[PDB]
């Protein structure tokens, strides 16, 4: 009756979402800034993401991953192994190297964390090395995304997770652009928090555009479900 964590209650409802990330690539400065909601209990978010200081440098798919791991949907027989939630309201750290196959680097830092009744994503994202006309720089990348599986282990040392994926973009040729995925995040605050066994989430995205939106945009419908331990 009692739930798994404190921070689980904070997720039975909607959930107004911020997201703030100021990025540079290659010296390319750009902000983002996102609003919409997320319904854990259907492992569901909705946002809408606009490019603050103009053209976006950098291709919107790329900055999916960036841009609430907690509006996850657990099954109930996994509940315990929930992290994210448990390290609310104070929140975490989740920091990520991700690495474009053949070309640059983006490196993450983000707090998440709740602001009021909030949950609020503050990013710094730096990307360097890549190519001028790889298929980040050079915008070679489709508007669509992937089905993909975040695999979760606890970082017991650390008090957090680790999280290993790959990402698929597809390319406008038809050919892939792997972005291999290393993540760690650490709680911000003192209060104990759920370490997870070996578990992983299954995502799926939706990308879109608001058609009277002038300004350079992503409209993002997402589903993701935790899976890998069975009942
Ligand atoms: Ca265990």
Known sequence: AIAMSKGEELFTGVVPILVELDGDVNGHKFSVSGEGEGDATYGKLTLKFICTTG??????????????????????????????????????VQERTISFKDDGNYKTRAEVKFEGDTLVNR??????????????????????????????????????????????????????????????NTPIGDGPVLLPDNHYLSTQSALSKDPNEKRDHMVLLEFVTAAGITH
């Open 123 to 184: 990013i710094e994202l730096k990307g360097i090395d890549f190519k001028e006309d790889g298929n980040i720089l050079g915008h070679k990348l489709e508007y669509n995304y992937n089905s993909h599986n975040v695999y979760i282990t606890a970082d017991k040392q650390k008090n957090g997770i680790k999280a290993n994926f790959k990402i698929r973009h597809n390319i406008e040729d038809g050919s892939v652009q792997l972005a291999d995925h290393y993540q760690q």
């Open 55 to 92: 053209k976006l440098p950098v291709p919107w798919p790329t900055l999916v991953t960036t841009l609430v791991q907690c509006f996850s949907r657990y099954p109930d027989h996994m509940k315990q192994h929930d992290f994210f939630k448990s390290a609310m309201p104070e929140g975490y």
